[PDB]
Enzyme design. Structure first.
Site: not given
Ligand SMILES: Nc1ncnc2c1ncn2[C@@H]1O[C@H](COP(=O)(O)OP(=O)(O)NP(=O)(O)O)[C@@H](O)[C@H]1O
Ligand SMILES: Nc1ncnc2c1ncn2[C@@H]1O[C@H](COP(=O)(O)OP(=O)(O)NP(=O)(O)O)[C@@H](O)[C@H]1O
Ligand SMILES: Nc1ncnc2c1ncn2[C@@H]1O[C@H](COP(=O)(O)OP(=O)(O)NP(=O)(O)O)[C@@H](O)[C@H]1O
Ligand SMILES: [Mg+2]
Ligand SMILES: [Mg+2]
Ligand SMILES: [Mg+2]
Lengths: 53, 469, 483, 484
Positions: D324, D349-352
């Protein structure tokens, strides 16, 4: 006078640069060529190992 | 009444042996073939089934015949351990090669041993002062640590080790073991003359270093194993003699190379770049035995050859994680006449830490490193467009970095022939301060040349005035 | 048909014959096929032997008989090979008849150990100004000649051989140096022509040629350097000295690669087998200088490697550099400019030879090593300021660069060399033009021979420069320059 | 009766080909009579190919191999905290038996689509650079990637150490139990790491799983999967675990060794054809479980080693596609004096922000995009430019923002300490300060706010959010300190 001094200094610095650039282009065309050969060989060895089994 | 078989197959270093009985020699056992001249030793590698074993010979296999009698020794390769090894020169099979008679040792230990467990580990953060500027400053060596020298061909690995033996060997108290793996027989001659001449080996008297050799003339089997031999001796000092031991190895790559020479002949499918699938675990089984334990301390220097100057080649690359300190030698650097040709931005230490060396030391090392780094990021532009096309900040940093670059060079005593200059040595505290001052802009008026091939900052001052006269 | 002493061919292809029988054969024993073609028992297996051929596959069929020979691959050796040209198996190719062998040595002989050796201290005089002054080679050393195609590699080795004519006509056997030249992979005509050159300069009587040329079978090329080292070794083991040129190892390695891939060994880097280093290393370890007890003989190796596009970092170059005791690197750039020998001093080194250098040269070579390859610092930067201090080193640098030039086939005596360098190092050339440094040198040596021959003789006979001879040499130098 | 037993047909290289064992299951544990244990990975017509979990020196042709009847499993449970075990869960710290809640197989189906919930709880790493720019959530896989000796472990290590702020409490929902997986490292390196966790009193909530460099390839391969199981227990029981795989590059090498010696035809760079699968099934197991499943999570920080900055290399390309987001660490940034040497442009950070304590989100506005606009300009400055008012200023701002992201190792920070720093930075309360003094600013200021405006910091820790009142107080408070 400052301008014509500058313009003479440009044509002079750029001559030394284009010369110096070509030199690196020459040195990197050689590295390019090595790497390209290496790429063809290394790819071939995987095909070869794969074929032997 | 022994265990005997006959030779069934011979391909290079690999010999296949059949046994007539149910009982078959264990993997890692030493076998023997009686020949015209001496005995050929073989090490069991694998069991092929149908009562046949595969072995790796320790000497050439020219002259062997199918049907030839094979003797089982009922044990692995064993070496003379103890003080009786000191001042002797020894084989991969533990026989002497200095014509000085039997090593009359009380014990002989197998060269294959299991590595010290996680429980047995003993960690420290104790600096080993070398008297070499770049090492002492930018990437400190650790007492009882594992130090490794990475270099392409001819860049300076061996001269470096000889300088370290020159620095640390005489005043250590403990014992040294030098192992030559896959190197120049002449270099062994050069060193056995050396340790004699310095007294570290005394013919009549007492000696501090044992030597073990398996040089590059030797068949692959011998190259692979000779490091395990020189190690087994190092371990006997560490353990039962509770000795603080110094172990030098030139060169550790040759061990892994010898492994690949035979891997094919053993039936394995080649991994990347033609290396053995077991490259890593083979290396773990060797590396992990070369450690400082709770029973005793081992400081180890390893020459590490870099094939084709490619530091990503499985061998050197897999070597990195095993070392607490790495000095990476660069061809590009050495070609500027910078010796030692240490890459100050690719050599690393666990011990480069303020909680070990003090904040002042850390801060200097790091600003030096930032400075050098700025020059690196700029090289392309300096070479294409010259100095003129830099901002003043940059121009000054570049001007300074080149003074640091040259100040990191140092006349070794053992390269006196190539330097023309006596070997200088610099105390850590002096390296720290000397560099600290250069950064502080205290030596900007000085021409670049005065930092090249000197000791500390007092020596720059001197050479600057020498030039100005 | 005894299947113990004898075999039947099962199959042949790719330079290998598979053979049934030969039960008593040894590993690496030489064999003979019906057609008279020879082979080497490479892999002994249950129920067959794999034999590498020393000729075309045409010369072997299925069903044919193969005879054991008794002998591990070996060759004739001894002073009787002198003046002779042979193939890799020792067979004469020069039209001159059976070789006169003192005996036979194996192709693969183990290297002198740690003990029977002594550091090199005896000069191998090349007669090349640049090599003798800056990369001095000692008897027993190994020194790589490396560089691109057509950069003078062979010339450097051949001048060295031609130069030995100086001592190989004397009586004193210790000063003599016999020569083994190995041609591996070269054109037959190159080698024929080379031998005629050697004959014309009367060098042939102290030299041996071992040729495995371009159209020959890979194993003959693989083998040649090894059989040439045993030939070279005879001199070594009998209190005499031999120089061996391996021209070139690049081609030996290529042949070895051919054999390994057809043997189906796994290709590694650049497709070479894992053992391509051991190929060279075992070969070159056989060069040595021996102890008093071992008779003090020496074999000196000059292996030749050929870089592509000037890259000394390729696999095979770095392998050999990690074996030999130094390199003489030849730059194609210098070569094209007319600077020949094109020795790039920056990149050339002798690791053990300094000891073995003739003192005279050593004395007038004060820092020449450091200075020259450093004038290269200024020179590269030169083409940003019309400086004062660093305008001098640009004028001296340029001079020593011309002094180092040298015509082919013209190796020069030490005592002919040291004056030219003295006259350069002390700046007596600074005033003379570039285009005349060539003429200066020939005219200066004439002057020295006719008028100050007493002094040359002293350089030759003591090999040192006494303060007096040093001062006397200053005298004669200044005189000639002025006119 | 060859149904439960077999005879070794041939052996070497940690591989044994066995006759019989007619009823053995694929992936089943076996015991060789000589002591050593193994795993059946090849089941062919006349034989069984087995990878050894130890030395093969003692195995012989004819030797007897026994079915265990068990697929490779491990002890799991809270009992394991504070301990160091090998891949099979055997204790290696000399502290005696482990007490386990139970045993889970090494290879476990990941959570399917239904039983999950979006990551929304932060994993506070304590590092300004990460937490502001690449915040990591509970159940996220965030790759750590870079060349040898670039800070990779030091990023993971400062996360584990930081969990102390919550792990010392009783509140179980906030606690983050740590699992560290050493694969192919040298034992000394691991001893040095559990020495450091000890000194920071972090060992009591961590479990070490070590398949170090001298151990059989089957042990190194297995270590991550059995270590997922140890970690899964926390996840499967309403708790939370972080899992560090140090490193997967070396595990991939071990799997390769395994497969070639089994004579399974290789693929690219000699790796097994399914080397992507090897890693994907491992990391799919990290997950944030839904409420009906107790709400536990497993966050994974897998570590990859690139060679020569080569992220296009086979394995690094595989893992990047699994996770992610990544943290790219770079040697060139390390030496400019950027620590952690995080390349901000390349790191996501994909979840962000859905996994970032709100206060930090607010004060770090477009920090990540801004820093990009900064380097867009630090590029135009190169050819000796002269900038207008906006560009020279933002060039000054970013140069200082970069400086504020520097951080010592083992010096992690709380969000309420992080927030004021990022707050002062982005707004410009640092522009008119000499560059070389931002380090001493950071500690003077956090002390100042601890003595003077402490009520503020207290607020941020508890309420995790900001209102106009918190903003203007702090804005008024920072503006105060600037005049020393
Ligand atoms: N400290 C030094 N000072 C000056 N010159 C040096 C130094 N170290 C190496 N050199 C030069 O480079 C050569 C390299 O020698 P060596 O130390 O054997 O390097 P190496 O990397 O072990 N070579 P190899 O093992 O054959 O690849 C020396 O003989 C010198 O000519
Ligand atoms: N010292 C010299 N002065 C002038 N010319 C020379 C000198 N040495 C060699 N040459 C000429 O330059 C050419 C190349 O020299 P040579 O010794 O054949 O190099 P090489 O590297 O062996 N070439 P090859 O082996 O064919 O790729 C030959 O034609 C020589 O005659
Ligand atoms: N924030 C920091 N500031 C200064 N130094 C640091 C920082 N973080 C790590 N280091 C040091 O830099 C070195 C490399 O860090 P490390 O965390 O081991 O990275 P790595 O890439 O895992 N190394 P390796 O496993 O050896 O490839 C270590 O000695 C650390 O102590
Ligand atoms: Mg060396
Ligand atoms: Mg030629
Ligand atoms: Mg690490």
């Amino acid at each position: 006078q400052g301008y014509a001094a500058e313009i003479s200094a440009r044509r002079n610095a750029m001559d030394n640069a284009s010369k110096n650039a070509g030199d690196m282009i020459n040195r990197y065309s050689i590295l390019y060529n090595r790497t390209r050969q290496a790429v063809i060989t290394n790819e071939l060895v995987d095909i070869i190992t794969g074929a032997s089994s | 009444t022994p265990i005997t078989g006959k030779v069934t197959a011979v391909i290079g270093a690999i010999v296949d042996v059949h046994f007539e009985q149910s009982e078959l020699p264990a993997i890692l056992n030493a076998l023997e073939i009686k020949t015209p001249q001496g005995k050929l030793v073989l090490e069991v590698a694998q069991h092929l089934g149908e009562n046949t074993v595969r072995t790796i010979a320790m000497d050439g296999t020219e002259g062997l015949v199918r049907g030839e009698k094979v003797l089982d020794t009922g044990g692995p390769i064993s070496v003379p351990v103890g003080r009786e090894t000191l001042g002797r020169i020894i084989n991969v099979i533990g026989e002497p090669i200095d014509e000085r008679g039997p090593i009359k040792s009380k014990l002989r230990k197998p060269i294959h041993a299991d590595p010290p467990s996680f429980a047995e580990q003993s960690t420290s953060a104790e600096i080993l002062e070398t008297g070499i500027k770049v090492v002492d400053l930018l990437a400190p060596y650790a007492r009882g640590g594992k130090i490794g020298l990475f270099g392409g061909a001819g860049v300076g690995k061996t001269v470096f080790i000889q300088e370290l033996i020159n620095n640390i060997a005489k005043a250590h108290g403990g014992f040294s073991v030098f192992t030559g793996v896959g190197e120049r027989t002449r270099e062994g001659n050069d060193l056995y003359r050396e340790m004699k001449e310095t007294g570290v080996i005394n013919l009549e008297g007492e000696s501090k270093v044992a030597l073990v050799f398996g040089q590059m003339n030797e068949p692959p089997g011998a190259r692979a194993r000779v490091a395990l031999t020189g190690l087994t001796i190092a371990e006997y000092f560490r353990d039962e003699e509770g000795q603080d031991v110094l172990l030098f190895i030139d060169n550790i790559f040759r061990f892994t190379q010898a492994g690949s020479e035979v891997s094919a002949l053993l039936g394995r499918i080649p991994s990347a770049v033609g290396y053995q699938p077991t490259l890593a675990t083979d290396m773990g089984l060797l590396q992990e035995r070369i450690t400082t334990t709770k029973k005793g301390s081992v400081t180890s220097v390893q020459a590490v050859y870099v094939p084709a100057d490619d530091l990503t080649d499985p061998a050197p690359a897999t070597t990195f994680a095993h070392l607490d300190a790495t000095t990476v030698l660069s061809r590009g650097i050495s070609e500027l006449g910078i010796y030692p040709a240490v890459d100050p931005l690719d050599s690393k230490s666990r011990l480069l830490d303020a909680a070990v060396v003090g904040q002042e030391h850390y801060d200097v090392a790091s600003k030096v490193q930032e400075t050098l780094q700025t020059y690196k990021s700029l090289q392309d532009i300096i070479a294409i467009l010259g100095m003129d096309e830099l901002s003043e900040q940059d121009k000054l940093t570049v001007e300074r970095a080149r003074k640091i670059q040259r100040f990191l060079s140092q006349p070794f005593a053992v390269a006196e022939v190539f330097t023309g200059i006596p070997g200088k040595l610099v105390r850590l505290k002096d390296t720290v301060a000397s560099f600290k001052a250069v950064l502080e802009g205290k030596y900007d008026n000085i021409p670049e040349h005065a930092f090249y091939m000197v000791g500390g900052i007092e020596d720059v001052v001197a050479k600057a005035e020498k030039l100005a006269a | 048909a005894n299947l113990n002493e004898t075999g039947r061919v099962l199959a042949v292809g790719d330079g290998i014959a598979r053979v049934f029988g030969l039960n008593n054969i040894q590993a690496e024993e030489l064999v003979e096929f019906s057609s008279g073609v020879k082979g080497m028992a490479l892999n002994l297996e249950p129920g067959q032997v794999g034999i590498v051929l020393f000729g075309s596959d045409r010369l072997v069929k299925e069903g044919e008989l193969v005879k054991r020979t008794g002998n591990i691959v070996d060759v004739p050796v001894g002073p009787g090979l002198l003046g002779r040209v042979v193939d890799a198996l020792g067979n004469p190719i020069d039209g001159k008849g059976p070789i006169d062998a003192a005996g036979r040595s194996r192709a693969q002989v183990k290297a002198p150990g740690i003990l029977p050796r002594r550091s090199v201290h005896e000069p191998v005089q090349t007669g090349l100004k640049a090599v003798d002054a800056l990369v001095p080679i000692g008897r027993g050393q190994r020194e790589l000649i490396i560089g691109d195609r057509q950069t003078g590699k062979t010339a450097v080795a051949l001048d060295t051989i031609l130069n030995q004519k100086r001592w190989n006509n004397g009586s004193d056997e210790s000063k003599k140096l016999y020569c083994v030249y190995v041609a591996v992979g070269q054109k037959r005509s190159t080698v024929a022509q080379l031998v005629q050159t050697l004959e014309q300069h009367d060098a042939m009587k102290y030299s041996i040629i071992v040729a495995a040329t371009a159209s020959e079978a890979a194993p003959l090329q693989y083998l040649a350097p090894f059989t040439a080292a045993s030939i070279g070794e005879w001199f070594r083991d009998n209190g005499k000295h031999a120089l061996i040129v391996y021209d070139d190892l690049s081609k030996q390695a290529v042949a070895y690669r051919q054999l390994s891939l057809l043997l189906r060994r796994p290709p590694g880097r650049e497709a070479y087998p894992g053992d391509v280093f051991y190929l060279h290393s075992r070969l070159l370890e056989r060069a040595a200088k021996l102890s008093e007890k071992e008779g003090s003989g020496s074999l000196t190796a000059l292996p030749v490697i050929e870089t592509q596009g000037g890259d000394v970092s390729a696999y095979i170059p770095t392998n050999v550099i990690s074996i030999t005791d130094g390199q003489i690197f030849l730059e194609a750039e210098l070569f094209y400019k007319g600077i020949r020998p094109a020795i790039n001093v920056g990149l050339s080194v002798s690791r053990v030879g300094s000891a073995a250098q003739v003192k005279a040269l050593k004395q007038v070579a004060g820092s020449l090593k450091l200075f020259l390859a450093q004038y290269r610092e200024v020179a590269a930067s030169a083409q940003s300021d019309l400086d004062a201090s660093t305008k001098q080193t640009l004028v001296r640098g340029e001079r020593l660069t011309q002094l180092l030039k040298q015509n082919q086939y013209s190796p020069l005596a030490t005592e002919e060399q040291v004056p030219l360098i003295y006259a350069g190092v002390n700046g007596h050339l600074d005033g003379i033009e570039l285009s005349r440094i060539g003429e200066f040198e020939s005219s200066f040596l004439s002057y020295l021979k006719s008028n100050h021959n007493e002094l040359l003789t002293e350089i030759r006979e003591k090999g040192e420069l006494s303060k007096e001879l040093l001062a006397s040499l200053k005298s004669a130098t200044e005189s000639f320059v002025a006119t």
